[PDB]
Amino acid sequence: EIIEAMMKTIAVDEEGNLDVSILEVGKSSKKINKIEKPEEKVIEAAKQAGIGTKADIEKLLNELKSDGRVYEPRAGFYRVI
Amino acid sequence: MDREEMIARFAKFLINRLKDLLTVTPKRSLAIDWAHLNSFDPELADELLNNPEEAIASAEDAIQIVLREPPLLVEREFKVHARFYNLPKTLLVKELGSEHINKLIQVEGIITRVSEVKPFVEKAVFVCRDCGNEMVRLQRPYENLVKPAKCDACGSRNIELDVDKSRFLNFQSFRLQDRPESLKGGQMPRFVDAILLDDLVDAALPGDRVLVTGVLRVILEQREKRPIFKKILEVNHIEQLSKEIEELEISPEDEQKIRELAKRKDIVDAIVDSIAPAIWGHRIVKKGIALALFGGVQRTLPDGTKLRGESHVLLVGDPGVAKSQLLRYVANLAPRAIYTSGKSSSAAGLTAAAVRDEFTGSWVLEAGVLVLADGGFALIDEFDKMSDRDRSAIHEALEQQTISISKAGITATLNSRTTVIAAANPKFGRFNRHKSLPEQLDLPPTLLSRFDLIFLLLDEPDEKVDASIAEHILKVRRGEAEAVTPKIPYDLLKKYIAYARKNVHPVLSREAMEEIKRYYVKMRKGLRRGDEDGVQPIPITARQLEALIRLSEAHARMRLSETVTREDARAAIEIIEAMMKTIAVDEEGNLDVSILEVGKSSKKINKIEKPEEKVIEAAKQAGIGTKADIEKLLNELKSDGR
Ligand SMILES: Nc1ncnc2c1ncn2[C@@H]1O[C@H](COP(=O)(O)OP(=O)(O)O)[C@@H](O)[C@H]1O
């Protein structure tokens, strides 16, 4: 009951994934970052695949710049590395 | 004390030992035995351990007289260093303390660090124009800079060094640590820095078992206190340790029960169940580790090459499958095992590297876990998180079993004859069954071509396999007897592995040769016809054929059989076929992963795909891939600039 009440008050995931180990959920996080990682796939894959909203993909491509998943030498054009 | 009398006593004991030296003139040293001197003159041999400063000097001048007096006397009286290789007691690096200072000791261990061939001046003649030219202030190579404050002859202070008349000698400083084979029980890698002189320099490499016997000297490196700050063993003689002392020994009463255990039925099943009894399942992984412990025969061909005799294992899987625990139980079960992590906690944590010492700033070659465990095992946990320097040298240490470093003024090659039973974690958190192994593994694709066994300890939810592991963990926590205890005790099994890796050397038989041949040709043409008009898949490579023979000989050595029985070669096929499913089979067809990938499809699509608003549409109606697949294809192409 303590373990059950802990998982409920945390809301760790929809399917109860162990986000405490990877800091990512399979459905809402791992599936999106797997499909995400001129600008061919930056504009096309964001539309025909329906990966997410404009604000949702913006934070993912931003975090991809730090982890090394999206590289863009120039500001006008952005690419995925 | 009675130095002149000791010279006469040394000359009395000195003559068959000096007789062969009288023949060989270029020999610049003389190997003298302490037990021989103890038989001739026990009181003289006792002074060797008590006052080694006056004993070595008096013995050198004494044997010089025993050299010039008889015939065949050399013209130039070359320096004859008294090398006492044998001693009545053998000390340990951990047992060594401040009590044995200025005493002739014989400490055993393994060399980890070593310096270059640094020349040092023996007779430091200082050039003083005013006066006092040939004056010598005898300095030792480890000692600090010696400089007189004033000339006693004329009172001048114009002091300088005369390196034209100075007689320089060779000098090398190494680090002797505890042997990880047996002295690792103390769990303290204590070190005693030692020095080397002429005929001792370049006499041993790092990661080698040596038995040094010298005088324990001291050095006042710091001026913060009058007492010494660091002790340095002045090595008088160096010698590599014998085989019996550097290998596991078995009692004669145990040699009978080890042979009795070999005659016991289902010996293979007993050893598999005896390896990590706490963890549930993974019997294929347990048998694969068992084949790695009883490594194959290592033979050398007369053509110069040496056939490999090790089987490296890699345990890839999601977190929570007790893949790190499997590297623990084997760490204590294996005879010579160094349990370590992939994290580069030191400059030479994984592979031997070069680092400048803190004493004189000179680069010293420090060994690693793949060097100290030579002729043994090295269980590397978290193999996917390694430094770039270690990742570049493991490609050679796993196949050629050599580590050739030629940087930082240190050029040499080591012997990395270790069985790397490693375990890596996927860089995506959990391993996906829809992607190949190097796609989710941080290890390079060429590095995977070295491991003979790669098991996938994946986590799969199933009511049958989860209810068994749940009740098994409960039995382990409850303290159940048969749930934690092995069928073969760890103490006896540790000797059983050393007995097989030393005495039993199986040889291939005609029955097993036909089984290895029929299996290799059976895999051929398994999937090559599939990917026609392009890169045809190679289901099995000749590299894996050598790995199959190593596993077939591993199963014969585990049974303590001097021949590879047809049943032994069949057992290695099941383990290979089981790994096939993990990689290169039962996944993207055969040839999967291989060197880099199956290519059957990926490579095939690569050649077809090979201001870009037109090329995205061109790939659409081409039908080579869906809009989602052709999207992810160019992300990997943009990664390499394509
Ligand atoms: N077959 C098994 N039997 C018993 N315990 C297991 C088994 N598989 C996984 N475990 C459990 O997994 C937990 C973590 O093990 P660990 O060695 O840390 O795996 P990893 O390092 O991959 O996370 C342990 O508490 C252990 O009890």
Short mmCIF file of all heavy atoms in Angstrom, two decimals, chain B residues 278-282 318-325 425 469 472-473, ligand 1:
data_model
loop_
_atom_site.label_atom_id
_atom_site.label_comp_id
_atom_site.label_asym_id
_atom_site.label_seq_id
_atom_site.Cartn_x
_atom_site.Cartn_y
_atom_site.Cartn_z
N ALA B 278 22.62 -17.21 -6.92
CA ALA B 278 21.61 -16.28 -6.44
C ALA B 278 20.72 -15.79 -7.58
O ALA B 278 19.49 -15.73 -7.44
CB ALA B 278 22.28 -15.10 -5.73
N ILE B 279 21.32 -15.43 -8.71
CA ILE B 279 20.53 -14.93 -9.83
C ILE B 279 19.76 -16.08 -10.47
O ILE B 279 20.26 -17.21 -10.59
CB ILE B 279 21.44 -14.22 -10.85
CG1 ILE B 279 20.62 -13.65 -12.01
CG2 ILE B 279 22.52 -15.17 -11.38
CD1 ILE B 279 21.45 -12.94 -13.06
N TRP B 280 18.52 -15.80 -10.86
CA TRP B 280 17.65 -16.80 -11.47
C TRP B 280 17.76 -16.75 -12.98
O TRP B 280 17.96 -15.68 -13.57
CB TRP B 280 16.19 -16.57 -11.05
CG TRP B 280 15.21 -17.43 -11.79
CD1 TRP B 280 14.75 -18.66 -11.41
CD2 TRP B 280 14.57 -17.14 -13.03
NE1 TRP B 280 13.86 -19.15 -12.34
CE2 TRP B 280 13.73 -18.23 -13.35
CE3 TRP B 280 14.62 -16.05 -13.92
CZ2 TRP B 280 12.96 -18.27 -14.50
CZ3 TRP B 280 13.85 -16.09 -15.06
CH2 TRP B 280 13.03 -17.19 -15.35
N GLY B 281 17.64 -17.92 -13.62
CA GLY B 281 17.66 -17.98 -15.06
C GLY B 281 19.03 -17.70 -15.65
O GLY B 281 20.07 -17.88 -15.00
N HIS B 282 19.02 -17.25 -16.90
CA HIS B 282 20.23 -16.94 -17.66
C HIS B 282 21.18 -18.14 -17.72
O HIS B 282 22.40 -17.98 -17.65
CB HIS B 282 20.95 -15.72 -17.07
CG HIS B 282 20.08 -14.52 -16.91
ND1 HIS B 282 19.82 -13.64 -17.94
CD2 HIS B 282 19.40 -14.05 -15.83
CE1 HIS B 282 19.02 -12.69 -17.51
NE2 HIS B 282 18.75 -12.91 -16.23
N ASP B 318 18.91 -4.44 -20.39
CA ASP B 318 18.29 -3.31 -19.71
C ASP B 318 18.65 -3.33 -18.22
O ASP B 318 18.94 -4.39 -17.66
CB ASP B 318 16.78 -3.35 -19.88
CG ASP B 318 16.36 -3.34 -21.34
OD1 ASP B 318 17.25 -3.28 -22.21
OD2 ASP B 318 15.14 -3.41 -21.61
N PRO B 319 18.64 -2.17 -17.56
CA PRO B 319 18.93 -2.14 -16.12
C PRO B 319 17.88 -2.90 -15.33
O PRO B 319 16.68 -2.84 -15.62
CB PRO B 319 18.91 -0.65 -15.78
CG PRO B 319 19.15 0.04 -17.09
CD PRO B 319 18.50 -0.82 -18.12
N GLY B 320 18.34 -3.62 -14.31
CA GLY B 320 17.47 -4.42 -13.48
C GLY B 320 17.50 -5.91 -13.74
O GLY B 320 16.70 -6.64 -13.14
N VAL B 321 18.40 -6.38 -14.60
CA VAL B 321 18.51 -7.80 -14.92
C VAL B 321 19.68 -8.46 -14.18
O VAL B 321 20.05 -9.59 -14.50
CB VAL B 321 18.63 -8.03 -16.43
CG1 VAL B 321 17.43 -7.42 -17.15
CG2 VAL B 321 19.93 -7.44 -16.95
N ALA B 322 20.26 -7.76 -13.20
CA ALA B 322 21.38 -8.28 -12.41
C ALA B 322 22.57 -8.64 -13.29
O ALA B 322 23.24 -9.66 -13.08
CB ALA B 322 20.95 -9.47 -11.55
N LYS B 323 22.85 -7.80 -14.29
CA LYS B 323 24.02 -8.02 -15.13
C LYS B 323 25.30 -7.62 -14.42
O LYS B 323 26.37 -8.15 -14.74
CB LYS B 323 23.88 -7.24 -16.45
CG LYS B 323 24.08 -5.74 -16.32
CD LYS B 323 24.29 -5.10 -17.68
CE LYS B 323 23.05 -5.24 -18.54
NZ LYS B 323 21.87 -4.56 -17.93
N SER B 324 25.22 -6.69 -13.46
CA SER B 324 26.40 -6.33 -12.68
C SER B 324 26.69 -7.35 -11.59
O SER B 324 27.85 -7.53 -11.21
CB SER B 324 26.21 -4.94 -12.07
OG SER B 324 25.68 -4.03 -13.02
N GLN B 325 25.66 -8.01 -11.07
CA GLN B 325 25.87 -9.05 -10.07
C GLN B 325 26.59 -10.25 -10.68
O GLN B 325 27.43 -10.88 -10.02
CB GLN B 325 24.54 -9.48 -9.46
CG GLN B 325 23.75 -8.35 -8.84
CD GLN B 325 22.45 -8.82 -8.22
OE1 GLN B 325 22.26 -10.01 -7.97
NE2 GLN B 325 21.54 -7.88 -7.97
N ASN B 425 25.71 -1.28 -21.14
CA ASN B 425 24.33 -0.84 -21.08
C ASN B 425 23.99 -0.02 -22.32
O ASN B 425 24.83 0.74 -22.81
CB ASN B 425 24.07 0.00 -19.82
CG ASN B 425 24.33 -0.77 -18.54
OD1 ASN B 425 25.21 -0.41 -17.76
ND2 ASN B 425 23.57 -1.83 -18.32
N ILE B 469 11.27 -15.81 -11.00
CA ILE B 469 12.33 -14.94 -10.48
C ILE B 469 11.85 -14.19 -9.25
O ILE B 469 12.67 -13.81 -8.40
CB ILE B 469 12.82 -13.98 -11.59
CG1 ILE B 469 14.13 -13.31 -11.17
CG2 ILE B 469 11.76 -12.94 -11.91
CD1 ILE B 469 14.68 -12.35 -12.21
N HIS B 472 12.17 -16.72 -6.48
CA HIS B 472 13.59 -17.02 -6.26
C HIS B 472 14.26 -15.94 -5.43
O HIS B 472 15.07 -16.24 -4.55
CB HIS B 472 14.30 -17.20 -7.60
CG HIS B 472 15.68 -17.77 -7.48
ND1 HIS B 472 15.97 -19.09 -7.76
CD2 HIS B 472 16.85 -17.21 -7.09
CE1 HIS B 472 17.26 -19.31 -7.56
NE2 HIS B 472 17.81 -18.18 -7.16
N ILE B 473 13.96 -14.67 -5.72
CA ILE B 473 14.51 -13.57 -4.92
C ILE B 473 14.02 -13.66 -3.49
O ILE B 473 14.77 -13.38 -2.54
CB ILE B 473 14.16 -12.22 -5.57
CG1 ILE B 473 14.93 -12.04 -6.88
CG2 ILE B 473 14.47 -11.07 -4.62
CD1 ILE B 473 14.67 -10.72 -7.57
N1 LIG C 1 17.48 -13.59 -12.26
C1 LIG C 1 17.53 -12.81 -11.16
N2 LIG C 1 17.57 -13.33 -9.92
C2 LIG C 1 17.62 -12.56 -8.83
N3 LIG C 1 17.63 -11.22 -8.88
C3 LIG C 1 17.60 -10.57 -10.05
C4 LIG C 1 17.55 -11.35 -11.29
N4 LIG C 1 17.52 -10.48 -12.31
C5 LIG C 1 17.56 -9.24 -11.77
N5 LIG C 1 17.62 -9.29 -10.43
C6 LIG C 1 17.64 -8.11 -9.53
O1 LIG C 1 18.07 -6.95 -10.25
C7 LIG C 1 18.49 -5.99 -9.29
C8 LIG C 1 19.59 -5.10 -9.85
O2 LIG C 1 20.65 -5.92 -10.33
P1 LIG C 1 21.89 -5.22 -11.06
O3 LIG C 1 23.05 -6.17 -10.99
O4 LIG C 1 22.05 -3.83 -10.51
O5 LIG C 1 21.46 -5.09 -12.59
P2 LIG C 1 21.97 -3.81 -13.40
O6 LIG C 1 23.31 -3.40 -12.86
O7 LIG C 1 21.80 -4.07 -14.88
O8 LIG C 1 20.90 -2.69 -12.98
C9 LIG C 1 18.98 -6.79 -8.10
O9 LIG C 1 18.37 -6.33 -6.90
C10 LIG C 1 18.59 -8.22 -8.36
O10 LIG C 1 17.93 -8.79 -7.23
#
